[model samples]
Target: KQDTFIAAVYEHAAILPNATLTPVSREEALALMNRNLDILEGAITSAADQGAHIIVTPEDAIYGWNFNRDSLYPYLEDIPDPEVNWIPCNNRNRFGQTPVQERLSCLAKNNSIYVVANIGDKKPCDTSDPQCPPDGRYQYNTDVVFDSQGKLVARYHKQNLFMGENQFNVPKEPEIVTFNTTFGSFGIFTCFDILFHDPAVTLVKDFHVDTIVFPTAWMNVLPHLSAVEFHSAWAMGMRVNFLASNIHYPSKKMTGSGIYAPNSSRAFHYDMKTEEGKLLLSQLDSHPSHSAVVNWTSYASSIEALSSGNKEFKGTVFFDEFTFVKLTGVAGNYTVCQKDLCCHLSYKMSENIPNEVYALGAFDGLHTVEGRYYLQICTLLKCKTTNLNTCGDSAETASTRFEMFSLSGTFGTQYVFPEVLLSENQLAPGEFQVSTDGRLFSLKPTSGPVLTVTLFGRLYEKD
Candidate 1:
């Protein structure tokens, strides 16, 4: 089994969004960006120290996106011209284009680990940027996957944009996509994307993907239980593994953070305030012999044993051909004569046990010409109680009377007798196997002579 382990980092921070279109001071913006970068650096260092092969971060990790008109439009950068578009959102995000890229490259090269980091962006209209604010701009949430060699592997623009927020931004209609990498074949779903099941199903059924990585900045809300349960059940139903990391809020409101396996089983759990991080590791074995699940049955062997009996010794033994076989003889009545010898009986009930035992045919030979017969049977054999209070009425006294009988039978009347046990003394206490197939019932030999047990049944059906 080749296992791929990932260290998912869930860091917390507080960056208030502008209520009005007030432009934030350059110093304040740079301060916020630096603070976020510091947290990212810490998470990477922690993951490296823990021997994580890869690290996954939440969306908008470096600079928290602003919902205001001025902030969203002004900070937008042209995707192509990396050299010239080193524009920072404000003083909060001081790093320009070259410095920011270099910083990420250094992080990946130094740690020698793959990093999947989400960034907030405002899509620029032209490949060559010149126009400002109101001309043309829209918000586009994105994720950047940095390879171990410091190269950017892939970038995915979010497809599903949240409602109500649409007044300021528009969603990317045909933006759904998956990434193929050396680590594994996995797809990405933004925070709200998890609520949609189609993306997950398409990834698994159509693309044959192995994992789903979700980057979200979900707001803090009470009664977190519903959200958590919904995600778990949805993921399990699709049978595709899911990884979710909630953005840390001021009060640490969004609590759940972990990895879920294909079966919806919790692989790992983490918390922001407690500093209880987890490194989830699992193998993706493609071996033919590898199995995800197994089924077990108790009736399989029971059915086989009941339907078939040992054919070698047939006639020499007392034989009877009746489907509805029942136990009979002295054991059905008389009390135990001694203490050492005890009575014991055991049998298997038919497959579809009628609502009541009365529905089954009885074991009486005379009724073969007509219909139903009483299978009611009682086995009274002489036996002793293991304790000193043999057959006594007191609680402490051993009461080993021939009152209990092990019973078993089937649906038909052809009783292919397997073995019989006759006794001068009563039967003793021990283990016995009963087969509903009516193949054979071996009443173990005890005390003295072998007792011959008779099968009694009355006919229920005839042509």
Candidate 2:
């Protein structure tokens, strides 16, 4: 395992629903946080015992969730940058008194393994400082990486903040943090940061990091945006290894974590039926033997159902305008375009789903629905009803199954993530191939109703 190392991600079930609503003393905050840290200590030992070289816990696992500006203040600690080369476990006074940082660094040292965790970082500034807050400090949602020797290695300040994150302040500049190890170099980011381009996309495209370490308290969005579903797709989209550790809070619909590589499925865990923590360990290959995405060549097409008709329309999917063509009678090959993007799909259906409508949609523009970003998505999905307007209106499962299907997109950009989701939030089998030339070739017929198949393309420069 020269270019490979064992990595573990713990989907932490932190002491939830216990955030302090009012401000407390720093000592009092540490007392409550230590309770969660005690649990973290146990998890660290458990992962190290099983030979994990590095371990990542979920974001905000120590402090829990839901806190106002003043209440969350005491929970934060002043963290020194990695360039300072200070180990909190050994040299505690380097950055004033940081009990939380010391405890985390000690976990890495005692286990002799790299530890990646997230916490709030407090930076003091005066009124003279333009970026200083009225509260005299800027509190950042941050990620810290400690090496095997317990030395601080990376510090990444999360750029993107969720709507309800009033407790943390966004940094003026997004921090790009990375660290090197026996396996490879890893860039760090958290939660909503992945949706942005500054540090998230730049981490790979500009910095050329081999892997990404993500600690997220991600809430699940159904039909297509489940935590695991999108996490795996993002890894493939960037062609980099991704280590994601999500907070396990089923009541909040946030339970999915995994270690994924480009076009590989080595380890993943997704369960919402229970309220407990899970630790997934797997061999992460920095330089794997099977290196590249395989393209589907010698495509022989003679399926009669793939004959096309002229039934194109414009509709809204996920708030972005999409050009759609109905999956015509029987099955047909359809081409739909949005501006410069052209989406092609050939399909054959097993049977007609009762009162169900299917369509192929192509969207190419700046998505201003939620987080603003550029996208060129080619999606084939089942409509909620016979009405075509409900194409992307969050339907989980469908009755109709696909006998065969193949999808490709003439995307201007090179980054595209492929997805095939079946009925009941199930991921389709590994019978699909992604080529460097931007094609998602579906090989075997699906085991259940085909809910959605997409080639999600990201236009980085357009952003």
Candidate 3:
């Protein structure tokens, strides 16, 4: 059997409420849900036409997010419960396959591809029963996986609930969700779980999962947590095939979807200020050829040491503040801190060697207390070559000749530069200096008090 897998990540501009919304009515919500179903079906068809084996949709792809929980009760349905039915916007399916699960199952079955989607789940409860709440319902943010034959394979309730979502949803215990197929085992997890320890990390550590299908409604965080950057980082850091799908509601700060693997190239789409949806497709190894062994025990020790105000180190220091600390080859943890800005760094190289290398830097500043601020970060990687000149100097030293991997964070519309290869003088240095030229690859926050600069790098070896 072929060990290659083709996967699709679908991003959608989901229907949302306007500013003047008191509350969305049931009719309006149903309309929006049906419309979203249409869009999702189209995406599945497109991906299937392109010969994709698996399709993953974003969180809340069926219904929009941030709606009042009380108002959402009507839309919630149980998975694989054929008896449960919702009011369809039309009479096209008289067979009573109106529930979200039935529709999704039919889509997967017809396309003959595995389908993973995020949706609202309703657990039955009796209002009159003392154990049950007055509403007789328990709502959960749930993810369901369906095999190519449209059989329900696995289900996972989201464990980490973000802001505003906790108000209406019940967070479940982290469970390692995996489904076996002809290719390999695929794990499942929702957004926010990526940042936490339980399901996201343990799934890979314990189960040795081959791929992770993530559905997210991510609000773009600056510097380190942007959807694309972090998604790719997790894939590279964990040495797994990561397939992530995010919503495309720009007004809600939602954008990013991609497929990443440790050995294959990356494919992603990210636009912070646009609602344009995209379908990202990539070919990944069904069984990853590489593996990463992370040392959590040593990492925890370093964190404990740093928290105890110990700064014993044997590496170079780039910056040291209250909440931010950038250094290399350090034995213990390092940190730097300032008002509204903080970063934590711990060295785990002592535990495991890396197979890839990256240089990450960030510049953040505040113009005024209430005014707009500028936040930007750049990541550079050493090119793979036997030639030393093209590879440039080690990231720990001052050298400008390096390949650009990605540039993100907040910046003015006016300031734009190349995101790829860079020569000398492309990036000028000032008080908050960032110079990318020969023998001078550096970032320093020397101008404003609120101005902060962080520089660090990672090195790894490829299998």
Candidate 4:
């Protein structure tokens, strides 16, 4: 018998100490942990009530991030045995009940849903013993998985520790952490592991896992590695179901979480800029629609080919006045000035094309030497149209038809848009922003450097 599964990604901001680069008292840390646990429990209950079978939270959801190692000692607990390293304090919430793991276990059992979360782990060791390391204790950034029965299933210690994380986190050797279930099997990994070779890639290659439960504290970096872009890219490139849950910290540039599938047309990404937390839910199936699975070998080959050079292409332009330019080399910092309008543009191509050509451009608006500016741009993928012969040599119109994916830029002060536009509706109006009407998106100009309107699209032969 087969079953339809519901997965939920919970994105929230965990409570942390206010001071920067400082340690907090044990009492204060404990209080914060308890408060965070309360938030987690509420999210879990809400998801379970909505019929989610598997629930995932973000990395460091328990103790929070950006804290000194010394301050984290009190919050660390041993796996399997959560009783160790815990000290009773007056500020501790009486409702918190027991250690971190135990509380999570109970929450899973009571809700009857599988739970995956991140927490601090302390390996048992004594400095007095000669065999122990100089530090005497191992502090690890760990991910723990709980079964529907509230039993501990698997634990993965993060291998790729980011900057400033090494001070408190002891990176461990990569391990293939997976667990079985009625619906499908799931592989586990923490943030930063997605970019590495051993755990993330190997797990899918060796085990052929159906799903990945990823808990991330993702910092949004533009061009590439943007929270939504990277997550969606990995899922589509790998041809697997990706459950991504990230922490919401605007100051730290941490936000965005979603569920992505290899066959799905769109990814369900949460708005991290919102003040309130989000509970995103999606349906999952054990078998995917597409047969091709992306592993390390194919990914490397595609990337290498893309970086080698850019290919020339042409396409038909629609809407307002537009120009299609085919360049021989890579795109660099270039300035285009026509009449009273001057435009400075920067373009970076990071991925290989599999038979299709792409064009990215910004459209109309104005700018001076002042602070205010208005800009509009759209990304287009060339497809075979009956009126155009760019698709291929074949005259048959039946072979020329294909799905066109359209994505628009978000006009706002905060939040970075992904490289690949999945939907035009994702864009929202901000201050000085007028409206978005599918084909045309406009921003009211105040005062800035350049101003112009242009249409850009790619044309490539179909295979």
Clashes of each: 47, 1, 15, 7
lDDT of 2 by residue, 1-463 (tens): 2678888899988885354446889887888788888887888899999999899988998887788778888899888878887888898877777988898889999999899998889899998898788988988888998888899898888898888888888888777778887788788899888777778888888888888889999987754577777788888777788889999988888888888887765577777788888999888787544446533221212122233555778777777788898886667788777787777788888997668899998898998755778988889988887888787778866998888887876677666777777776666547666754556767777788888888777776877
Cα lDDT of model 1 by residue, 81-115, tens digit: 22232212222143444344455656765777666
Candidate 1: stretches off by over 4 Å: 1-3, 14-21, 25-31, 80-102, 126-134, 164-168, 197-200, 219-227, 250-252, 264-463
Using lDDT as the measure, which candidate wins?
Answer: 2
Whole-model lDDT, candidate 1?
A: 0.42
lDDT of 4 by residue, 1-463 (tens): 3566888998888786576466666676677877998999999999999999999999988777766566677777766432232222222343253367777777888889999999887775786755555666777888988777777787888887776685355444577789888878789898877755558877777998888999999886432345665676566556678899999887777777888776442345545455667789988887566753222112112222222222323332222222222212233333322222222323333322344333333333332221122322233323333222332221111211112122223222111122332221121112121112211222332122111112221111110
Please report, in order, the local distance difference test score of every candidate based on alpha carbons.
0.42, 0.80, 0.56, 0.56
* Most accurate candidate by TM-score: 2
Tens digits of lDDT, candidate 3, 100-140: 76777777888888889888777767856565556676788
In candidate 1, how many Å is residue 96 off?
Answer: 7.8
> Which residue ranges in model 3 land beyond 4 Å of their true spot?
17-28, 80-98, 127-131, 291-463
Give the TM-score (vs. native) of candidate 1: 0.51
Off by over 4 Å in 2: 17-21, 289-309
Model 4 C-alpha lDDT versus the unseen true structure: 0.56
In model 4, pairs of residues that clash are 362-377, 363-376, 364-453, 367-448, 368-448, 368-449, 372-447
Ranked candidates, highest TM-score first: 2, 3, 4, 1
